[PDB]
Amino acid sequence: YNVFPRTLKWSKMNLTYRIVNYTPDMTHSEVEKAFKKAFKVWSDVTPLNFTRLHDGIADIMISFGIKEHGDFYPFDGPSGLLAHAFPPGPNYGGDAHFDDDETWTSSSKGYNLFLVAAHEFGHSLGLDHSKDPGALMFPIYTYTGKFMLPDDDVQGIQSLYGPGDED
Ligand SMILES: c1cc(-c2csnn2)ccn1
Ligand SMILES: [Ca+2]
Ligand SMILES: [Ca+2]
Ligand SMILES: [Zn+2]
Ligand SMILES: [Zn+2]
Numbered sequence: 001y002n003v004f005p006r007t008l009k010w011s012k013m014n015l016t017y018r019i020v021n022y023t024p025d026m027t028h029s030e031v032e033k034a035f036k037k038a039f040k041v042w043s044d045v046t047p048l049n050f051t052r053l054h055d056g057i058a059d060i061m062i063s064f065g066i067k068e069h070g071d072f073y074p075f076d077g078p079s080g081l082l083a084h085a086f087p088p089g090p091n092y093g094g095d096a097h098f099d100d101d102e103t104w105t106s107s108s109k110g111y112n113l114f115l116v117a118a119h120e121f122g123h124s125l126g127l128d129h130s131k132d133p134g135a136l137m138f139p140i141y142t143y144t145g146k147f148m149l150p151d152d153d154v155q156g157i158q159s160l161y162g163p164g165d166e167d
Helices: 028-043 113-125 151-161
Strands: 014-019 049-053 060-065 083-085 096-099
Touching: 014 028, 028 049, 028 113, 083 113, 096 113, 113 151
Parallel strands: 014 049, 014 060, 060 096
Antiparallel strands: 083 096
8 A cells, every 4th residue: 555645745756847938038048047057956955857858748847927827826917926836746736837927037137037946946846935034945035146055945855855965
């Protein structure tokens, strides 16, 4: 037999993702780079592997959309809601949606796509919000320039997947 696990998490270390569409605000290459790096944040501290698919069904489907976009979490136009992702689970589990009425950047302007994606993918992997204001998973976006995953987030993700190679 098998009972349900303690926490929502992926039962496999190999995860796929697909960028289903692209924001007008950035080039395809900038978007792809920001998401690659956002995934690397998590894979660097776990045994998780992330492979990109160009078509088909992925564990983590990534899309930009506005207003009603095919779920119970419709966006609100410019300002307010920003992005959201679903915990691991069947179908839409793992998926990450970005509001294309916000402005997305690879700078300190607007919302940095890398930082928000890194936060969203934490949700895609099984992390909820942290109370640590310095943590990546703190609910409120702040821009940081340098990237070092804060220890609250390292401990959180490793509680789910282990550390993988510690050096
Ligand atoms: C997107 C990004 C964030 C975030 C980045 S750093 N700390 N929180 C929170 C909510 N939505
Ligand atoms: Ca999915
Ligand atoms: Ca919005
Ligand atoms: Zn959505
Ligand atoms: Zn969040």
